[PDB]
Amino acid sequence: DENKLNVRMLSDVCMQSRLLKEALESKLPLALEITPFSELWLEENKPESRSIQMLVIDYSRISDDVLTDYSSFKHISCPDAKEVIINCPQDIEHKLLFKWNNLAGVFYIDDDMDTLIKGMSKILQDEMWLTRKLAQEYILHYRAGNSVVTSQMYAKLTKREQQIIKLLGSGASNIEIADKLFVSENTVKTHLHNVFKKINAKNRLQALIWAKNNIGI
Amino acid sequence: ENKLNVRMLSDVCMQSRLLKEALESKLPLALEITPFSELWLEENKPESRSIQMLVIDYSRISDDVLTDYSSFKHISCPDAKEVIINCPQDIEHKLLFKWNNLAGVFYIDDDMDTLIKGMSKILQDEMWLTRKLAQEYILHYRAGNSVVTSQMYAKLTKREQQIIKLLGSGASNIEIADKLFVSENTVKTHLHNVFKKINAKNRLQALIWAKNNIGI
Ligand SMILES: Nc1nc2c(ncn2[C@@H]2O[C@@H]3COP(=O)(O)O[C@H]4[C@@H](O)[C@H](n5cnc6c(=O)[nH]c(N)nc65)O[C@@H]4COP(=O)(O)O[C@H]3[C@H]2O)c(=O)[nH]1
Numbered sequence: 172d173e174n175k176l177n178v179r180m181l182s183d184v185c186m187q188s189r190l191l192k193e194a195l196e197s198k199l200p201l202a203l204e205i206t207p208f209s210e211l212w213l214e215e216n217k218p219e220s221r222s223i224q225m226l227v228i229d230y231s232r233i234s235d236d237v238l239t240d241y242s243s244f245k246h247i248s249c250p251d252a253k254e255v256i257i258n259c260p261q262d263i264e265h266k267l268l269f270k271w272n273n274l275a276g277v278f279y280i281d282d283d284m285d286t287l288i289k290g291m292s293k294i295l296q297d298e299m300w301l302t303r304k305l306a307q308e309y310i311l312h313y314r315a316g317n318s319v320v321t322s323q324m325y326a327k328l329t330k331r332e333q334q335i336i337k338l339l340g341s342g343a344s345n346i347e348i349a350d351k352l353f354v355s356e357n358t359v360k361t362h363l364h365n366v367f368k369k370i371n372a373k374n375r376l377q378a379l380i381w382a383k384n385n386i387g388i
Numbered sequence: 389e390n391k392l393n394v395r396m397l398s399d400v401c402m403q404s405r406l407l408k409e410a411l412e413s414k415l416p417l418a419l420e421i422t423p424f425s426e427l428w429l430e431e432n433k434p435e436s437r438s439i440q441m442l443v444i445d446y447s448r449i450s451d452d453v454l455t456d457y458s459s460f461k462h463i464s465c466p467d468a469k470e471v472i473i474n475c476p477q478d479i480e481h482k483l484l485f486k487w488n489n490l491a492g493v494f495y496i497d498d499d500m501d502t503l504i505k506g507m508s509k510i511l512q513d514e515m516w517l518t519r520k521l522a523q524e525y526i527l528h529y530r531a532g533n534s535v536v537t538s539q540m541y542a543k544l545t546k547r548e549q550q551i552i553k554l555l556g557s558g559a560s561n562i563e564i565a566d567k568l569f570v571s572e573n574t575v576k577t578h579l580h581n582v583f584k585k586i587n588a589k590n591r592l593q594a595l596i597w598a599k600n601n602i603g604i
């Protein structure tokens with residue numbers, strides 16, 4: 172429906188998902204389609220993807236190897252879409268949540284539907300549904316001048332590889348990188364191919380988008 | 389009681405609880421949710437013996453939890469009915485026979501109206517099986533066939549096969565060393581290598597495995 176909010180839920184399709192989809196569409200002015208993380212890469216360049224206004228991210232189906240796929244999907248098709256996490260672990264580390272650049276709300280593995288509908292309805296009115304502590308962490312962090320939280324994959328790279336990535340995620344060219352590290356152009360090309368694991372970049376654009384969101388000062 | 393004691397093997401999450409609510413509100417049953425990975429903790433609880441139905445969520449199932457399942461079923465609720473949900477449309481019928489009390493299958497794309505319709509037929513002691521699936525049962529069992537040999541079995545070495553096959557007849561350690569003319573501590577050492585592949589925490593799991601996985 173043209174009237175409704177275009178929402179895309181990253182999860183399995185199954186009895187439960189479809190039940191959830193039904194439950195949401197019943198009580199809120201939104202049109203939800205389900206797309207598994209594994210299939211995200213196929214939606215990246217579809218025209219209808221550009222119309223998503225909200226991603227419902229099912230944390231209980233998330234994994235490190237789908238993350239690069241997510242980041243390039245977000246940036247390519249719907250960078251302005253809000254993001255909402257469901258099934259978040261209670262004991263989750265606040266800074267791990269900061270990678271969701273448009274995080275609008277978090278719903279926890281043991282939240283009931285009363286809560287999901289109450290929160291979702293507030294998000295749809297452009298409110299946030301964040302916990303007090305979580306809110307406080309944002310403020311502390313950001314207000315104190317910090318932005319990106321450097322991920323774990325990065326810290327697992329060799330020195331050459333780190334240096335080469337840092338630059339990439341500043342938008343440097345291959346040749347630009349070569350010249351800053353005093354190295355052959357094909358040299359850096361060869362490191363990047365190694366770096367496309369486990370960052371998991373199917374290509375350069377991906378990695379470059381990975382870098383911008385995953386490696387910070 | 390007054391309600392059927394149903395246990396659903398699945399993740400706990402928004403969706404699962406939604407499903408549980410949806411089920412409990414349309415049928416006379418009391419559902420609790422227990423994740424596969426956590427099944428071994430429930431194996432020896434008193435309340436596990438009260439389970440009358442297992443709703444097995446195929447989408448959350450893997451081979452490493454299977455031997456955990458078969459020992460749980462047999463120790464705690466061998467007579468409980470089994471009902472599969474989120475089954476792949478294209479699943480190979482023979483693979484389904486390992487559920488000794490299968491009563492119903494629900495497929496990845498079945499809607500709730502179908503879930504409620506079948507569950508009610510099951511609660512009336514009817515089955516919710518596809519025409520072909522029913523047919524495959526008859527063809528197979530009618531022709532006197534029994535356990536379908538797993539893929540895990542076919543993967544281990546002839547030595548290990550021979551030793552397992554005998555275990556899955558209920559032979560002793562020494563009885564096995566003696567049929568294969570081998571050292572008693574030799575068979576013990578193969579079993580350990582097998583328990584790893586099979587995923588048996590112990591010998592009991594192992595032999596409950598062989599019974600359900602290594603006919604004929
Ligand atoms: N009277 C009052 N109490 C407050 C307020 N803020 C926090 N609390 C208390 O602190 C508990 C946990 O807050 P939370 O971690 O932010 O976690 C909250 C928050 O994440 C969400 N939530 C509940 N209601 C609202 C709401 O009206 N607005 C927003 N933005 N979030 C809410 O649900 C979670 C648990 O809700 P509770 O069971 O109510 O549990 C709340 C409530 O007992 C407040 O402004 N007024």
Ligand SMILES: Nc1nc2c(ncn2[C@@H]2O[C@@H]3COP(=O)(O)O[C@H]4[C@@H](O)[C@H](n5cnc6c(=O)[nH]c(N)nc65)O[C@@H]4COP(=O)(O)O[C@H]3[C@H]2O)c(=O)[nH]1
Pocket residue numbers: 515516517518519520
């Ligand atoms: N009028 C009639 N048509 C039959 C009969 N048996 C099978 N069909 C036709 O065959 C289709 C697929 O059969 P199925 O694999 O058993 O697959 C069926 C079966 O697994 C289940 N189902 C539907 N209704 C019933 C029911 O009343 N009893 C049982 N036991 N299963 C049902 O849902 C699946 C899809 O159902 P359908 O959309 O109806 O699609 C059914 C229906 O079009 C029958 O006895 N009478």
